[PDB]
Amino acid sequence: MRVVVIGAGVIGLSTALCIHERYHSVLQPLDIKVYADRFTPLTTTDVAAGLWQPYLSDPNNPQEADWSQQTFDYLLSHVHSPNAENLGLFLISGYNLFHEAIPDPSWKDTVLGFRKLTPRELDMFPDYGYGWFHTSLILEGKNYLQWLTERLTERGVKFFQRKVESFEEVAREGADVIVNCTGVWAGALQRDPLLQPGRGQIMKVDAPWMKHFILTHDPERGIYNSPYIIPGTQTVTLGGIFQLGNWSELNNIQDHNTIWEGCCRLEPTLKNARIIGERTGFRPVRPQIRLEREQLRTGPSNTEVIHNYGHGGYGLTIHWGCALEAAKLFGRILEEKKLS
Amino acid sequence: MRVVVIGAGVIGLSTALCIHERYHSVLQPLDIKVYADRFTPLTTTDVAAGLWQPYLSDPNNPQEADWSQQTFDYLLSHVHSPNAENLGLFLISGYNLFHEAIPDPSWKDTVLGFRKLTPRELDMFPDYGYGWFHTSLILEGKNYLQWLTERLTERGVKFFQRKVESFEEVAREGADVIVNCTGVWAGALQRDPLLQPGRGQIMKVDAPWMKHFILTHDPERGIYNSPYIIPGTQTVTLGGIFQLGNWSELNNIQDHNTIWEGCCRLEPTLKNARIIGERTGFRPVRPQIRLEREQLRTGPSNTEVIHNYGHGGYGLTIHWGCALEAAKLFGRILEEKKLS
Ligand SMILES: Cc1cc2nc3c(=O)[nH]c(=O)nc-3n(C[C@H](O)[C@H](O)[C@H](O)COP(=O)(O)OP(=O)(O)OC[C@H]3O[C@@H](n4cnc5c(N)ncnc54)[C@H](O)[C@@H]3O)c2cc1C
Ligand SMILES: Cc1cc2nc3c(=O)[nH]c(=O)nc-3n(C[C@H](O)[C@H](O)[C@H](O)COP(=O)(O)OP(=O)(O)OC[C@H]3O[C@@H](n4cnc5c(N)ncnc54)[C@H](O)[C@@H]3O)c2cc1C
Ligand SMILES: Oc1cccnc1O
Ligand SMILES: Oc1cccnc1O
């Protein structure tokens, strides 16, 4: 039973882990290998602040609401363990701000102590007249990736640095199952007109007095395109850039100024902050996550492919539920192959 | 009009400033001097984390409730000014934890978004079965003292390092008004059996993933004797030591282990925190603050004394209200001296 996971971002590594921990005791030769073009300092997952918050509107696929929920419940049950720091997991509260009244989010009961902003609170934000406060979680991409990595290593999973040119190439070389977690780059292996980059650019700043996240929302400009501030473990993330179809993996002066003007307007104390770093990445945007099986007809017998990609701006928020679901699909392959 | 402020902790410095800004334009020869034995790194004020939160039970003197509200309102009006960091002022949310239901506090409408804990939140704290969540402010002593100092200097207020042996000594050398801001040490200038040290000890820790304050309450061990965790700007404060009558300005191994065990039980992730510093200070405990006038019968004509001391575990919380009220008493001296 030879398994190749393509992708070493959050989706790949979590999925790889979830499959191993669930089926290594019911499969004798269960070889799991991770093939990736880039690893854990240099993926999109690394660029993310790691805040748990799904989109405000209900998911096209209501399944996604569950996957996010399961991810929250799971992370929360580990927020008070000696590991948390190593994962980069911790609790944070903060504000979602809007110009006008809007309906509560579907997830309002997943988070802790979700409530509307009282007028006292809104006065700290001239530009805003409505919003929420709640306590969520941060799972810092970098850390989380390192942790998954050493968890995978100690479980025997081998890692290889390579670009896969096609599914067949990997099946040809002997994989029985292929787990496709190639993110925004999925379409280079199998055309997907629905999958597209939402370019994001962030600034890492030194503002340790910042203890709340602050997300602003403008329907006029679109989701993820309004300034946000998200404190991390060691630094504070400044953002508010979302540009569909842009493939330029390079920091942009204009976007820098936009991050900075928006965030300073939002929180004046930020002016005396020190700029540490800046980064760009590509949310793998898609009307819904592709997470399903496909029998790839190649040679004598077809090899099995589990797709797990298109997590847009919520990959950390949802990764774990998706990983449990990929593992499920994996178990169904086994029983059909009469190996369970 | 020669004015002497005795004391350079938060009470001295804020009262000095408050008096200058309110009366420098209505008195020509208004000279203000601060006499203190210890300054801004070496005061009890500096040992304090800076959380704004009055005692749970109502004050002996209900005036104190306003003085706190006033301090809060004022600090909150500057939370977003571009000075804030220099002040060491910032917003923070957090938990008050209890073993049993208790009535809401009187200040519940001063803080932001005050509410009770939901069951989900309580599960993060086995040992506790009830509590609060709300958003407050932190005014870090060290920074705030540094800030007042530069404000006072540019106002031409002179500081002198010296231990004052008596009120007479000071009046003898020319002061018309004396502002008594000598904290826990006040009894040495005028016996006060009501005033006593509530010794405290705290650990400063490197735990920057900690974004919430956590205060625990136990009636069996009593106020400030229960473990607490309070994130600052650069470090986190570990505490929960209150000992009436203890005059030992020296870090105690036992207390160290108590802080540590209590806080680790409370937040297991603190196990891998790095210990940076440790400090001891003396809460100026007294059944109520002494903030009032006294005409001290010295030499030919008596000199006026404003007492401002005995702020216990809540000096930073209340200091501003206290200063405005000390200035008011000052205004009354002037009109009696027929000089307004
Ligand atoms: C700026 C920003 C902020 C974000 N903030 C949040 C947040 O705050 N909270 C949240 O939940 N989500 C957030 N996200 C979303 C999150 O960043 C992404 O959803 C998530 O990282 C998607 O990860 P992935 O594993 O799908 O892909 P990636 O992390 O990009 O990993 C894809 C992997 O596949 C590999 N690969 C691709 N093609 C091949 C190939 N042909 N051969 C070999 N290897 C290949 C790549 O090398 C890489 O290893 C944010 C996103 C951005 C851009
Ligand atoms: C461990 C600990 C933690 C605390 N945490 C908090 C908190 O989180 N939030 C909060 O609101 N409060 C807290 N407090 C309470 C706060 O620290 C005190 O209320 C406050 O510092 C008292 O300030 P003060 O200016 O009266 O006295 P001090 O800060 O001690 O200043 C007194 C000054 O008077 C001088 N002085 C005294 N006698 C003489 C003399 N004869 N001649 C000359 N100078 C003299 C001293 O040198 C000193 O300069 C804490 C206290 C402790 C001990
Ligand atoms: O830019 C983002 C901010 C928060 C969550 N997801 C994103 O993509
Ligand atoms: O130790 C303390 C913590 C918070 C407030 N006051 C104190 O004294």
PDB file of C-alpha atoms in Angstrom, chain B residues 58-240:
ATOM      1  CA  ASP B  58     -17.636  47.966  47.046  1.00  0.00           C
ATOM      2  CA  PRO B  59     -15.298  50.576  48.541  1.00  0.00           C
ATOM      3  CA  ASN B  60     -15.596  51.721  52.127  1.00  0.00           C
ATOM      4  CA  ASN B  61     -15.692  55.185  50.570  1.00  0.00           C
ATOM      5  CA  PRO B  62     -17.938  55.255  47.477  1.00  0.00           C
ATOM      6  CA  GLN B  63     -16.007  58.297  46.264  1.00  0.00           C
ATOM      7  CA  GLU B  64     -13.347  55.742  45.245  1.00  0.00           C
ATOM      8  CA  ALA B  65     -15.747  54.154  42.732  1.00  0.00           C
ATOM      9  CA  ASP B  66     -15.874  57.459  40.844  1.00  0.00           C
ATOM     10  CA  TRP B  67     -12.142  57.982  41.086  1.00  0.00           C
ATOM     11  CA  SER B  68     -11.678  54.643  39.330  1.00  0.00           C
ATOM     12  CA  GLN B  69     -14.323  55.340  36.716  1.00  0.00           C
ATOM     13  CA  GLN B  70     -12.638  58.638  36.055  1.00  0.00           C
ATOM     14  CA  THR B  71      -9.201  57.118  35.658  1.00  0.00           C
ATOM     15  CA  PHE B  72     -10.662  54.509  33.293  1.00  0.00           C
ATOM     16  CA  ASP B  73     -12.533  57.053  31.135  1.00  0.00           C
ATOM     17  CA  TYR B  74      -9.466  59.202  30.861  1.00  0.00           C
ATOM     18  CA  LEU B  75      -7.090  56.402  29.937  1.00  0.00           C
ATOM     19  CA  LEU B  76      -9.589  54.987  27.451  1.00  0.00           C
ATOM     20  CA  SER B  77      -9.793  58.426  25.792  1.00  0.00           C
ATOM     21  CA  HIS B  78      -6.061  58.141  25.103  1.00  0.00           C
ATOM     22  CA  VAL B  79      -5.840  54.459  24.248  1.00  0.00           C
ATOM     23  CA  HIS B  80      -5.609  55.314  20.539  1.00  0.00           C
ATOM     24  CA  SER B  81      -3.428  58.404  20.748  1.00  0.00           C
ATOM     25  CA  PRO B  82       0.032  57.985  19.164  1.00  0.00           C
ATOM     26  CA  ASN B  83       1.627  58.409  22.619  1.00  0.00           C
ATOM     27  CA  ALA B  84       0.015  55.246  24.019  1.00  0.00           C
ATOM     28  CA  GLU B  85       3.124  53.027  23.680  1.00  0.00           C
ATOM     29  CA  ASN B  86       5.274  55.663  25.466  1.00  0.00           C
ATOM     30  CA  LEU B  87       2.726  55.537  28.269  1.00  0.00           C
ATOM     31  CA  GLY B  88       2.630  51.728  28.151  1.00  0.00           C
ATOM     32  CA  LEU B  89      -1.141  51.965  27.837  1.00  0.00           C
ATOM     33  CA  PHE B  90      -3.132  49.413  25.916  1.00  0.00           C
ATOM     34  CA  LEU B  91      -6.330  47.374  25.768  1.00  0.00           C
ATOM     35  CA  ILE B  92      -6.507  43.875  27.170  1.00  0.00           C
ATOM     36  CA  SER B  93      -9.241  41.289  27.734  1.00  0.00           C
ATOM     37  CA  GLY B  94      -9.201  38.422  30.158  1.00  0.00           C
ATOM     38  CA  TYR B  95     -10.794  36.104  32.694  1.00  0.00           C
ATOM     39  CA  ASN B  96     -11.796  36.453  36.321  1.00  0.00           C
ATOM     40  CA  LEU B  97     -12.226  32.924  37.664  1.00  0.00           C
ATOM     41  CA  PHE B  98     -14.090  31.701  40.726  1.00  0.00           C
ATOM     42  CA  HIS B  99     -15.117  28.478  42.476  1.00  0.00           C
ATOM     43  CA  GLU B 100     -18.701  29.666  43.009  1.00  0.00           C
ATOM     44  CA  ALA B 101     -21.215  32.184  41.615  1.00  0.00           C
ATOM     45  CA  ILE B 102     -20.660  35.672  43.025  1.00  0.00           C
ATOM     46  CA  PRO B 103     -22.468  38.959  42.352  1.00  0.00           C
ATOM     47  CA  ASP B 104     -21.428  41.197  39.434  1.00  0.00           C
ATOM     48  CA  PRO B 105     -18.915  43.868  40.370  1.00  0.00           C
ATOM     49  CA  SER B 106     -19.888  47.506  40.742  1.00  0.00           C
ATOM     50  CA  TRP B 107     -17.590  48.493  37.853  1.00  0.00           C
ATOM     51  CA  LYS B 108     -19.080  46.011  35.379  1.00  0.00           C
ATOM     52  CA  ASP B 109     -20.302  48.908  33.280  1.00  0.00           C
ATOM     53  CA  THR B 110     -17.017  50.767  33.314  1.00  0.00           C
ATOM     54  CA  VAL B 111     -15.044  47.967  31.646  1.00  0.00           C
ATOM     55  CA  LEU B 112     -15.878  47.020  28.083  1.00  0.00           C
ATOM     56  CA  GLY B 113     -18.093  44.104  27.158  1.00  0.00           C
ATOM     57  CA  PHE B 114     -18.395  42.675  30.617  1.00  0.00           C
ATOM     58  CA  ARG B 115     -20.077  39.229  30.659  1.00  0.00           C
ATOM     59  CA  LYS B 116     -20.075  35.876  32.400  1.00  0.00           C
ATOM     60  CA  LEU B 117     -18.075  32.911  31.161  1.00  0.00           C
ATOM     61  CA  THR B 118     -19.842  30.357  28.920  1.00  0.00           C
ATOM     62  CA  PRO B 119     -19.402  26.696  29.699  1.00  0.00           C
ATOM     63  CA  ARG B 120     -17.010  26.228  26.768  1.00  0.00           C
ATOM     64  CA  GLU B 121     -14.618  28.801  28.339  1.00  0.00           C
ATOM     65  CA  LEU B 122     -14.807  27.260  31.822  1.00  0.00           C
ATOM     66  CA  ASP B 123     -13.600  23.890  30.484  1.00  0.00           C
ATOM     67  CA  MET B 124     -10.172  25.481  29.913  1.00  0.00           C
ATOM     68  CA  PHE B 125      -9.923  25.864  33.698  1.00  0.00           C
ATOM     69  CA  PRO B 126     -10.710  22.567  35.606  1.00  0.00           C
ATOM     70  CA  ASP B 127     -10.132  24.026  39.101  1.00  0.00           C
ATOM     71  CA  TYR B 128     -12.665  26.780  38.490  1.00  0.00           C
ATOM     72  CA  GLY B 129     -16.394  26.702  38.010  1.00  0.00           C
ATOM     73  CA  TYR B 130     -17.504  30.273  37.408  1.00  0.00           C
ATOM     74  CA  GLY B 131     -16.302  33.629  36.164  1.00  0.00           C
ATOM     75  CA  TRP B 132     -16.094  36.752  34.071  1.00  0.00           C
ATOM     76  CA  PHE B 133     -14.708  37.874  30.741  1.00  0.00           C
ATOM     77  CA  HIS B 134     -14.248  41.519  29.894  1.00  0.00           C
ATOM     78  CA  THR B 135     -11.944  44.019  28.240  1.00  0.00           C
ATOM     79  CA  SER B 136      -9.915  46.404  30.420  1.00  0.00           C
ATOM     80  CA  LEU B 137      -6.660  48.458  30.132  1.00  0.00           C
ATOM     81  CA  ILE B 138      -3.106  48.097  31.288  1.00  0.00           C
ATOM     82  CA  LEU B 139      -1.058  51.082  32.309  1.00  0.00           C
ATOM     83  CA  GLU B 140       2.428  49.684  32.953  1.00  0.00           C
ATOM     84  CA  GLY B 141       3.999  51.419  35.973  1.00  0.00           C
ATOM     85  CA  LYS B 142       7.599  51.599  34.687  1.00  0.00           C
ATOM     86  CA  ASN B 143       6.699  53.287  31.343  1.00  0.00           C
ATOM     87  CA  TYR B 144       3.986  55.443  32.876  1.00  0.00           C
ATOM     88  CA  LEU B 145       6.354  56.776  35.493  1.00  0.00           C
ATOM     89  CA  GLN B 146       8.937  57.467  32.765  1.00  0.00           C
ATOM     90  CA  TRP B 147       6.253  59.337  30.793  1.00  0.00           C
ATOM     91  CA  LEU B 148       5.074  61.490  33.691  1.00  0.00           C
ATOM     92  CA  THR B 149       8.687  62.301  34.429  1.00  0.00           C
ATOM     93  CA  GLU B 150       9.339  63.697  30.929  1.00  0.00           C
ATOM     94  CA  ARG B 151       6.002  65.554  31.072  1.00  0.00           C
ATOM     95  CA  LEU B 152       6.911  67.043  34.493  1.00  0.00           C
ATOM     96  CA  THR B 153      10.445  67.996  33.358  1.00  0.00           C
ATOM     97  CA  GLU B 154       9.345  69.927  30.279  1.00  0.00           C
ATOM     98  CA  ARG B 155       7.044  71.755  32.729  1.00  0.00           C
ATOM     99  CA  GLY B 156      10.023  72.840  34.743  1.00  0.00           C
ATOM    100  CA  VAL B 157       9.175  70.706  37.784  1.00  0.00           C
ATOM    101  CA  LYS B 158      12.381  69.878  39.601  1.00  0.00           C
ATOM    102  CA  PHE B 159      13.065  66.466  41.047  1.00  0.00           C
ATOM    103  CA  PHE B 160      15.374  65.899  44.013  1.00  0.00           C
ATOM    104  CA  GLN B 161      16.602  62.641  45.467  1.00  0.00           C
ATOM    105  CA  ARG B 162      16.203  62.766  49.248  1.00  0.00           C
ATOM    106  CA  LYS B 163      14.612  61.131  52.264  1.00  0.00           C
ATOM    107  CA  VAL B 164      12.286  63.518  54.078  1.00  0.00           C
ATOM    108  CA  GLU B 165      12.503  63.108  57.890  1.00  0.00           C
ATOM    109  CA  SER B 166       9.488  65.252  58.725  1.00  0.00           C
ATOM    110  CA  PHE B 167       6.866  67.666  57.487  1.00  0.00           C
ATOM    111  CA  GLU B 168       8.421  70.416  59.638  1.00  0.00           C
ATOM    112  CA  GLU B 169      11.760  69.924  57.928  1.00  0.00           C
ATOM    113  CA  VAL B 170      10.087  70.736  54.617  1.00  0.00           C
ATOM    114  CA  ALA B 171       7.954  73.649  55.803  1.00  0.00           C
ATOM    115  CA  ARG B 172      11.016  75.036  57.661  1.00  0.00           C
ATOM    116  CA  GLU B 173      12.878  75.162  54.360  1.00  0.00           C
ATOM    117  CA  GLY B 174      10.046  77.159  52.706  1.00  0.00           C
ATOM    118  CA  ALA B 175       7.139  75.071  51.338  1.00  0.00           C
ATOM    119  CA  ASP B 176       3.637  76.586  51.527  1.00  0.00           C
ATOM    120  CA  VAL B 177       1.806  73.390  50.509  1.00  0.00           C
ATOM    121  CA  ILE B 178       3.030  69.797  50.954  1.00  0.00           C
ATOM    122  CA  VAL B 179       1.565  66.932  48.953  1.00  0.00           C
ATOM    123  CA  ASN B 180       1.988  63.694  50.841  1.00  0.00           C
ATOM    124  CA  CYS B 181       2.353  60.791  48.396  1.00  0.00           C
ATOM    125  CA  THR B 182       4.669  58.545  50.374  1.00  0.00           C
ATOM    126  CA  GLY B 183       2.732  55.314  49.777  1.00  0.00           C
ATOM    127  CA  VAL B 184       3.303  52.475  52.228  1.00  0.00           C
ATOM    128  CA  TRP B 185       5.983  54.484  54.016  1.00  0.00           C
ATOM    129  CA  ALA B 186       3.581  57.228  55.087  1.00  0.00           C
ATOM    130  CA  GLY B 187       3.397  56.207  58.788  1.00  0.00           C
ATOM    131  CA  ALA B 188       7.017  57.363  59.229  1.00  0.00           C
ATOM    132  CA  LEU B 189       6.028  61.021  58.735  1.00  0.00           C
ATOM    133  CA  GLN B 190       2.786  60.805  60.690  1.00  0.00           C
ATOM    134  CA  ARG B 191       1.749  57.660  62.510  1.00  0.00           C
ATOM    135  CA  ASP B 192      -1.211  55.943  60.821  1.00  0.00           C
ATOM    136  CA  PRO B 193      -2.241  52.652  62.438  1.00  0.00           C
ATOM    137  CA  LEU B 194      -4.681  51.991  59.555  1.00  0.00           C
ATOM    138  CA  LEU B 195      -1.974  51.790  56.907  1.00  0.00           C
ATOM    139  CA  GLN B 196      -0.035  48.550  56.351  1.00  0.00           C
ATOM    140  CA  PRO B 197       2.070  46.693  53.766  1.00  0.00           C
ATOM    141  CA  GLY B 198       0.393  44.052  51.662  1.00  0.00           C
ATOM    142  CA  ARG B 199       3.647  42.587  50.435  1.00  0.00           C
ATOM    143  CA  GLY B 200       3.494  41.231  46.906  1.00  0.00           C
ATOM    144  CA  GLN B 201       5.904  39.259  44.825  1.00  0.00           C
ATOM    145  CA  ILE B 202       5.844  38.807  41.027  1.00  0.00           C
ATOM    146  CA  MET B 203       7.684  36.906  38.310  1.00  0.00           C
ATOM    147  CA  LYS B 204       8.270  38.423  34.846  1.00  0.00           C
ATOM    148  CA  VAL B 205       8.160  35.760  32.187  1.00  0.00           C
ATOM    149  CA  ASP B 206       8.670  35.486  28.461  1.00  0.00           C
ATOM    150  CA  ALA B 207       5.373  34.049  27.240  1.00  0.00           C
ATOM    151  CA  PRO B 208       4.306  36.268  24.328  1.00  0.00           C
ATOM    152  CA  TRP B 209       1.624  33.837  23.139  1.00  0.00           C
ATOM    153  CA  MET B 210      -0.381  34.926  26.195  1.00  0.00           C
ATOM    154  CA  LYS B 211      -2.897  37.561  25.045  1.00  0.00           C
ATOM    155  CA  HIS B 212      -5.368  37.503  28.015  1.00  0.00           C
ATOM    156  CA  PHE B 213      -5.148  38.327  31.687  1.00  0.00           C
ATOM    157  CA  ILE B 214      -6.286  35.547  33.973  1.00  0.00           C
ATOM    158  CA  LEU B 215      -7.110  36.404  37.608  1.00  0.00           C
ATOM    159  CA  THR B 216      -8.135  33.692  40.076  1.00  0.00           C
ATOM    160  CA  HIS B 217     -10.128  34.302  43.197  1.00  0.00           C
ATOM    161  CA  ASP B 218     -10.294  32.345  46.405  1.00  0.00           C
ATOM    162  CA  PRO B 219     -12.033  33.537  49.604  1.00  0.00           C
ATOM    163  CA  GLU B 220     -10.016  30.946  51.618  1.00  0.00           C
ATOM    164  CA  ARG B 221      -6.736  32.559  50.566  1.00  0.00           C
ATOM    165  CA  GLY B 222      -8.057  36.088  49.949  1.00  0.00           C
ATOM    166  CA  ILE B 223      -7.551  38.961  47.494  1.00  0.00           C
ATOM    167  CA  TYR B 224      -4.267  38.974  45.478  1.00  0.00           C
ATOM    168  CA  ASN B 225      -3.197  35.713  47.127  1.00  0.00           C
ATOM    169  CA  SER B 226      -4.534  33.615  44.349  1.00  0.00           C
ATOM    170  CA  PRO B 227      -2.587  32.931  41.079  1.00  0.00           C
ATOM    171  CA  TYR B 228      -2.760  35.556  38.358  1.00  0.00           C
ATOM    172  CA  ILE B 229      -1.241  36.037  34.911  1.00  0.00           C
ATOM    173  CA  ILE B 230      -1.104  39.399  33.316  1.00  0.00           C
ATOM    174  CA  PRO B 231       0.524  39.988  29.876  1.00  0.00           C
ATOM    175  CA  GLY B 232       2.464  43.200  29.632  1.00  0.00           C
ATOM    176  CA  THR B 233       3.993  44.903  26.661  1.00  0.00           C
ATOM    177  CA  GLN B 234       7.268  42.867  26.534  1.00  0.00           C
ATOM    178  CA  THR B 235       6.729  40.303  29.219  1.00  0.00           C
ATOM    179  CA  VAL B 236       4.081  38.528  31.261  1.00  0.00           C
ATOM    180  CA  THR B 237       3.495  39.054  35.014  1.00  0.00           C
ATOM    181  CA  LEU B 238       3.146  35.995  37.215  1.00  0.00           C
ATOM    182  CA  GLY B 239       1.704  36.667  40.683  1.00  0.00           C
ATOM    183  CA  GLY B 240      -0.743  35.917  43.534  1.00  0.00           C
TER     184      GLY B 240
END
